[PDB]
Design a protein around this ligand. Structure first.
Ligand SMILES: *[C@@H]1O[C@H](CO)[C@@H](O[C@@H]2O[C@H](CO)[C@@H](O)[C@H](O)[C@H]2NC(C)=O)[C@H](O)[C@H]1NC(C)=O
Ligand code: E64
Length: 219
Protein backbone atom coordinates (compact mmCIF):
# COMPACT_ATOMS: atom_id res chain seq x y z
CA UNK A 1 0.00 0.00 0.00
CA UNK A 2 1.55 3.28 -1.16
CA UNK A 3 2.93 5.78 1.35
CA UNK A 4 3.02 8.45 -1.39
CA UNK A 5 0.51 8.98 -4.21
CA UNK A 6 0.58 11.63 -6.94
CA UNK A 7 -1.99 11.00 -9.68
CA UNK A 8 -0.44 13.76 -11.84
CA UNK A 9 2.53 11.47 -12.49
CA UNK A 10 0.20 8.78 -13.88
CA UNK A 11 -1.44 11.21 -16.33
CA UNK A 12 -4.82 11.31 -14.56
CA UNK A 13 -5.06 15.08 -13.86
CA UNK A 14 -5.71 17.97 -16.27
CA UNK A 15 -3.88 21.30 -15.93
CA UNK A 16 -4.97 23.71 -13.23
CA UNK A 17 -8.05 25.75 -14.21
CA UNK A 18 -9.38 29.09 -12.95
CA UNK A 19 -12.98 29.50 -11.79
CA UNK A 20 -12.70 33.32 -11.82
CA UNK A 21 -15.44 35.19 -9.96
CA UNK A 22 -18.12 32.53 -10.17
CA UNK A 23 -19.09 30.31 -7.23
CA UNK A 24 -18.43 27.16 -9.26
CA UNK A 25 -15.86 25.35 -7.10
CA UNK A 26 -18.27 22.40 -6.97
CA UNK A 27 -18.16 22.13 -10.78
CA UNK A 28 -14.34 22.16 -10.97
CA UNK A 29 -14.13 19.57 -8.18
CA UNK A 30 -16.66 17.34 -9.98
CA UNK A 31 -14.96 17.58 -13.37
CA UNK A 32 -11.60 16.93 -11.73
CA UNK A 33 -12.68 13.65 -10.19
CA UNK A 34 -14.57 12.49 -13.30
CA UNK A 35 -11.58 13.43 -15.47
CA UNK A 36 -9.57 11.07 -13.28
CA UNK A 37 -12.10 8.23 -13.51
CA UNK A 38 -12.54 8.59 -17.26
CA UNK A 39 -8.76 8.47 -17.79
CA UNK A 40 -8.18 5.54 -15.46
CA UNK A 41 -10.84 3.48 -17.26
CA UNK A 42 -10.04 4.48 -20.88
CA UNK A 43 -6.43 5.69 -20.97
CA UNK A 44 -7.62 9.02 -22.46
CA UNK A 45 -7.36 12.24 -20.44
CA UNK A 46 -10.28 14.40 -21.57
CA UNK A 47 -10.88 17.83 -20.02
CA UNK A 48 -14.56 18.25 -19.09
CA UNK A 49 -16.91 21.25 -19.10
CA UNK A 50 -17.55 23.06 -15.82
CA UNK A 51 -19.83 25.45 -17.74
CA UNK A 52 -22.06 22.49 -18.71
CA UNK A 53 -22.58 21.87 -14.99
CA UNK A 54 -23.01 25.56 -14.09
CA UNK A 55 -25.63 26.15 -16.81
CA UNK A 56 -27.56 22.87 -16.80
CA UNK A 57 -27.65 21.15 -13.40
CA UNK A 58 -30.07 23.42 -11.48
CA UNK A 59 -32.74 20.70 -11.35
CA UNK A 60 -30.32 18.54 -9.34
CA UNK A 61 -29.95 21.12 -6.57
CA UNK A 62 -27.17 23.35 -7.94
CA UNK A 63 -27.47 27.11 -8.35
CA UNK A 64 -24.86 27.90 -10.98
CA UNK A 65 -22.40 30.59 -9.94
CA UNK A 66 -24.22 30.90 -6.60
CA UNK A 67 -22.99 27.46 -5.50
CA UNK A 68 -23.62 23.76 -5.65
CA UNK A 69 -22.40 20.31 -4.64
CA UNK A 70 -20.21 17.70 -6.30
CA UNK A 71 -22.70 14.87 -5.68
CA UNK A 72 -25.45 16.97 -7.30
CA UNK A 73 -23.19 17.28 -10.34
CA UNK A 74 -22.56 13.51 -10.49
CA UNK A 75 -26.32 12.90 -10.37
CA UNK A 76 -26.97 15.39 -13.17
CA UNK A 77 -24.28 13.75 -15.31
CA UNK A 78 -25.89 10.33 -14.77
CA UNK A 79 -29.41 11.54 -15.60
CA UNK A 80 -28.15 13.57 -18.58
CA UNK A 81 -26.21 10.74 -20.19
CA UNK A 82 -22.91 12.56 -19.91
CA UNK A 83 -20.98 15.83 -19.73
CA UNK A 84 -19.54 17.82 -22.64
CA UNK A 85 -15.83 18.35 -23.21
CA UNK A 86 -14.17 21.54 -22.00
CA UNK A 87 -13.18 22.25 -25.61
CA UNK A 88 -16.76 22.11 -26.94
CA UNK A 89 -18.41 23.91 -23.99
CA UNK A 90 -15.76 26.26 -22.60
CA UNK A 91 -15.87 28.23 -19.37
CA UNK A 92 -17.24 31.77 -19.13
CA UNK A 93 -17.35 32.32 -15.38
CA UNK A 94 -20.98 33.49 -15.48
CA UNK A 95 -24.42 31.90 -15.37
CA UNK A 96 -25.71 30.98 -18.81
CA UNK A 97 -28.48 29.13 -20.58
CA UNK A 98 -27.93 25.39 -20.96
CA UNK A 99 -26.49 24.55 -24.39
CA UNK A 100 -25.58 20.93 -23.67
CA UNK A 101 -24.86 18.96 -26.86
CA UNK A 102 -25.16 15.16 -26.90
CA UNK A 103 -22.64 14.89 -29.74
CA UNK A 104 -19.83 16.54 -27.71
CA UNK A 105 -19.97 14.29 -24.62
CA UNK A 106 -16.52 13.63 -23.20
CA UNK A 107 -17.36 11.41 -20.22
CA UNK A 108 -20.27 9.92 -18.29
CA UNK A 109 -20.93 8.55 -14.83
CA UNK A 110 -23.45 6.14 -13.33
CA UNK A 111 -23.64 7.44 -9.76
CA UNK A 112 -21.26 8.29 -6.95
CA UNK A 113 -19.76 7.06 -3.68
CA UNK A 114 -19.48 9.10 -0.48
CA UNK A 115 -16.40 8.41 1.65
CA UNK A 116 -17.11 7.82 5.35
CA UNK A 117 -17.50 11.22 7.02
CA UNK A 118 -14.40 12.37 8.89
CA UNK A 119 -12.33 9.24 8.14
CA UNK A 120 -8.93 10.19 6.77
CA UNK A 121 -7.84 6.56 6.57
CA UNK A 122 -10.78 5.84 4.27
CA UNK A 123 -10.00 8.94 2.19
CA UNK A 124 -6.39 7.74 1.89
CA UNK A 125 -7.57 4.33 0.68
CA UNK A 126 -9.87 6.00 -1.86
CA UNK A 127 -7.12 8.27 -3.20
CA UNK A 128 -4.81 5.26 -3.59
CA UNK A 129 -7.28 2.73 -5.00
CA UNK A 130 -9.85 4.86 -6.90
CA UNK A 131 -8.14 8.01 -8.16
CA UNK A 132 -8.47 11.74 -7.49
CA UNK A 133 -11.28 12.36 -4.98
CA UNK A 134 -13.64 15.34 -4.77
CA UNK A 135 -13.35 16.94 -1.33
CA UNK A 136 -14.91 19.87 0.54
CA UNK A 137 -12.75 22.11 2.76
CA UNK A 138 -12.84 25.19 4.94
CA UNK A 139 -10.85 27.60 2.74
CA UNK A 140 -12.20 30.71 4.51
CA UNK A 141 -8.97 31.74 6.25
CA UNK A 142 -6.55 34.32 4.88
CA UNK A 143 -3.73 31.82 5.47
CA UNK A 144 -5.26 29.72 2.67
CA UNK A 145 -5.36 32.68 0.28
CA UNK A 146 -1.68 33.37 1.02
CA UNK A 147 -0.44 29.75 0.94
CA UNK A 148 2.94 29.42 -0.78
CA UNK A 149 4.65 26.12 0.00
CA UNK A 150 5.15 23.49 2.67
CA UNK A 151 2.32 21.83 4.57
CA UNK A 152 -0.64 24.12 5.24
CA UNK A 153 -1.50 23.84 8.95
CA UNK A 154 -4.35 26.11 10.10
CA UNK A 155 -5.48 25.38 13.68
CA UNK A 156 -8.40 27.80 13.21
CA UNK A 157 -9.87 25.60 10.48
CA UNK A 158 -13.32 24.09 10.85
CA UNK A 159 -14.15 20.48 10.01
CA UNK A 160 -17.88 21.26 10.05
CA UNK A 161 -18.28 24.55 8.14
CA UNK A 162 -16.97 23.88 4.63
CA UNK A 163 -17.11 26.41 1.80
CA UNK A 164 -14.82 25.25 -1.02
CA UNK A 165 -14.76 22.13 -3.19
CA UNK A 166 -11.35 20.99 -4.45
CA UNK A 167 -9.66 17.75 -5.57
CA UNK A 168 -7.43 15.36 -3.61
CA UNK A 169 -4.91 14.00 -6.13
CA UNK A 170 -2.43 12.39 -3.76
CA UNK A 171 -0.78 12.32 -0.35
CA UNK A 172 2.58 11.85 1.31
CA UNK A 173 4.79 13.11 4.12
CA UNK A 174 6.92 16.28 4.16
CA UNK A 175 9.21 17.50 6.97
CA UNK A 176 7.71 14.76 9.13
CA UNK A 177 4.14 16.03 8.54
CA UNK A 178 1.58 13.95 6.67
CA UNK A 179 -0.08 15.91 3.85
CA UNK A 180 -2.83 15.74 1.24
CA UNK A 181 -1.93 16.87 -2.28
CA UNK A 182 -4.82 19.14 -3.32
CA UNK A 183 -5.60 20.69 -6.73
CA UNK A 184 -7.36 24.07 -6.49
CA UNK A 185 -9.31 26.02 -9.15
CA UNK A 186 -7.68 29.43 -8.64
CA UNK A 187 -5.26 29.27 -11.57
CA UNK A 188 -1.64 28.20 -11.63
CA UNK A 189 -0.28 31.42 -10.09
CA UNK A 190 -1.87 30.59 -6.72
CA UNK A 191 -0.13 28.35 -4.20
CA UNK A 192 2.36 25.83 -5.60
CA UNK A 193 1.54 26.05 -9.31
CA UNK A 194 -2.15 25.85 -8.37
CA UNK A 195 -1.74 23.12 -5.71
CA UNK A 196 -1.63 23.06 -1.91
CA UNK A 197 -0.29 20.47 0.54
CA UNK A 198 -2.87 20.32 3.34
CA UNK A 199 -2.40 18.74 6.76
CA UNK A 200 -3.23 15.03 6.94
CA UNK A 201 -3.87 13.04 10.13
CA UNK A 202 -4.39 16.22 12.14
CA UNK A 203 -7.98 15.40 13.18
CA UNK A 204 -9.56 16.01 9.76
CA UNK A 205 -8.18 19.54 9.51
CA UNK A 206 -10.33 21.93 7.44
CA UNK A 207 -12.80 19.06 7.02
CA UNK A 208 -11.04 17.53 4.01
CA UNK A 209 -12.45 14.08 4.82
CA UNK A 210 -15.91 15.33 5.84
CA UNK A 211 -17.64 15.42 2.41
CA UNK A 212 -15.35 13.43 0.10
CA UNK A 213 -16.85 11.58 -2.86
CA UNK A 214 -16.15 10.28 -6.34
CA UNK A 215 -18.19 9.38 -9.43
CA UNK A 216 -18.86 5.82 -10.49
CA UNK A 217 -18.19 4.85 -14.11
CA UNK A 218 -19.63 1.82 -15.89
CA UNK A 219 -21.00 -1.04 -13.81
C1 LIG B 1 -20.70 16.55 5.04
O1 LIG B 1 -19.95 17.08 6.10
C2 LIG B 1 -20.73 17.63 7.13
C3 LIG B 1 -19.82 18.44 8.03
O2 LIG B 1 -18.98 17.58 8.76
C4 LIG B 1 -21.47 16.48 7.80
O3 LIG B 1 -22.34 16.97 8.78
C5 LIG B 1 -21.97 16.40 10.04
O4 LIG B 1 -22.26 15.02 10.05
C6 LIG B 1 -21.91 14.38 11.26
C7 LIG B 1 -22.12 12.90 11.03
O5 LIG B 1 -21.58 12.16 12.09
C8 LIG B 1 -22.75 14.97 12.40
O6 LIG B 1 -22.32 14.49 13.66
C9 LIG B 1 -22.62 16.49 12.46
O7 LIG B 1 -23.58 17.05 13.31
C10 LIG B 1 -22.81 17.13 11.09
N1 LIG B 1 -22.43 18.52 11.11
C11 LIG B 1 -23.19 19.52 10.64
C12 LIG B 1 -22.57 20.90 10.76
O8 LIG B 1 -24.29 19.36 10.16
C13 LIG B 1 -22.33 15.76 6.77
O9 LIG B 1 -22.92 14.60 7.30
C14 LIG B 1 -21.50 15.35 5.55
N2 LIG B 1 -22.36 14.84 4.51
C15 LIG B 1 -22.13 13.69 3.86
C16 LIG B 1 -23.14 13.32 2.80
O10 LIG B 1 -21.16 12.98 4.09
C1 E64 C 1 -17.18 27.18 -3.86
C2 E64 C 1 -16.28 28.22 -4.53
O1 E64 C 1 -16.67 28.64 -5.67
O2 E64 C 1 -15.26 28.60 -3.96
C3 E64 C 1 -18.64 27.65 -3.86
O3 E64 C 1 -18.78 28.81 -3.08
C4 E64 C 1 -19.60 26.53 -3.46
O4 E64 C 1 -20.46 26.14 -4.24
N1 E64 C 1 -19.47 26.00 -2.24
C5 E64 C 1 -20.34 24.92 -1.83
C6 E64 C 1 -19.59 23.99 -0.90
C7 E64 C 1 -18.32 23.45 -1.54
C8 E64 C 1 -18.63 22.64 -2.79
C9 E64 C 1 -17.61 22.59 -0.51
C10 E64 C 1 -21.61 25.45 -1.17
O5 E64 C 1 -21.54 26.15 -0.17
N2 E64 C 1 -22.75 25.09 -1.78
C11 E64 C 1 -24.07 25.48 -1.34
C12 E64 C 1 -25.19 25.04 -2.28
C13 E64 C 1 -25.67 23.61 -2.10
C14 E64 C 1 -27.06 23.39 -2.69
N3 E64 C 1 -28.10 23.97 -1.86
C15 E64 C 1 -29.41 23.87 -2.09
N4 E64 C 1 -30.25 24.45 -1.23
N5 E64 C 1 -29.92 23.21 -3.11
Amino acid sequence: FPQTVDWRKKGAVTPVKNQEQCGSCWAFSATGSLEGQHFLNTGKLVSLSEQNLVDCSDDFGNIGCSGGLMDNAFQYIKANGGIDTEKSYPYTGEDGQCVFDKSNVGAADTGFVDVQTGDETQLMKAVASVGPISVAIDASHISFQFYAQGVYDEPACSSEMLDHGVLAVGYGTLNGKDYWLVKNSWGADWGQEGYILMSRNKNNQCGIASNASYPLVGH
